Amino acid sequence: MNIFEMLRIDEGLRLKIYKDTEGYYTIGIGHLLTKSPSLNAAKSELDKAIGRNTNGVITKDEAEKLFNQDVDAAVRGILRNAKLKPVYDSLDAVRRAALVNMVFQMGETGVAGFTNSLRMLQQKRWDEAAVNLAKSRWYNQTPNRAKRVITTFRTGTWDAYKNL
Ligand SMILES: [Cl-]
Ligand SMILES: [Cl-]
Ligand SMILES: [K+]
Predict the structure, then answer these.
(1) Closest CA to 103 of 112, 116, 94, 95
(2) Can 20 be counted among the known catalytic residues?
(3) What CATH number should be reported for the domain whose range is 1-164?
(4) DSSP letters spanning 79-94
(5) Which of 5, 10, 20, 72 is catalytic?
(6) Which letter does DSSP use for residue 25 in this model?
(7) Could you give the dihedral angle defined by the CA atoms of residues 66, 69, 73 and 74, in that order, rounded to the nearest 10 degrees?
(8) How far is CA 72 from CA 63, 64, 101, in A?
(9) What residues does 31 pair with on adjacent strands?
(10) Among 14, 34, 73, 137, which is least packed, fewest CB within 10 Å?
(11) Exposed/middle/buried for 139, CB within 10 Å: 0-12, 13-18, 19+?
(12) Considering only CA atoms, which of 162, 160, 128 is closest in space to residue 145?
């Protein structure tokens, strides 16, 4: 198990534009295209991202290319954020991946706002952080996924993703 495998399970793989859990056009492995309700607008973002006039369908290789970029960008975002970096640096590699997962799903800004949870994580108060993390729109809207990520922070193991 690793960040790529983890997110691949959480986000799935779809080669044609589809709507994510929030109703937003996306493609590939969770690559958000736009929050706009315009399919045309989503298609234009797709072409710009891939570098060719696609017509809304991409190949697996292309999906993986964006995914790698996206994971790298999430890590980049954490490292540049004053609220997230210290937490990230304080964690073991397994827990680090859980934080990258959250940023990939909600963005740097979103996660940086979980101030109290972040503090509990930095303090290594695992069970308390897990309870706190669940008190969120994130958990309520995507509870099974959230639960997986939370168990990862709670235990520092990949048990929630084993057998998937
Ligand atoms: Cl992009
Ligand atoms: Cl879910
Ligand atoms: K998805």
Answers:
(1) 112
(2) yes
(3) 1.10.530.40
(4) HT-TTTHHHHHHS-HH
(5) 20
(6) E
(7) 60
(8) 14, 12, 11
(9) 27
(10) 137
(11) middle
(12) 160
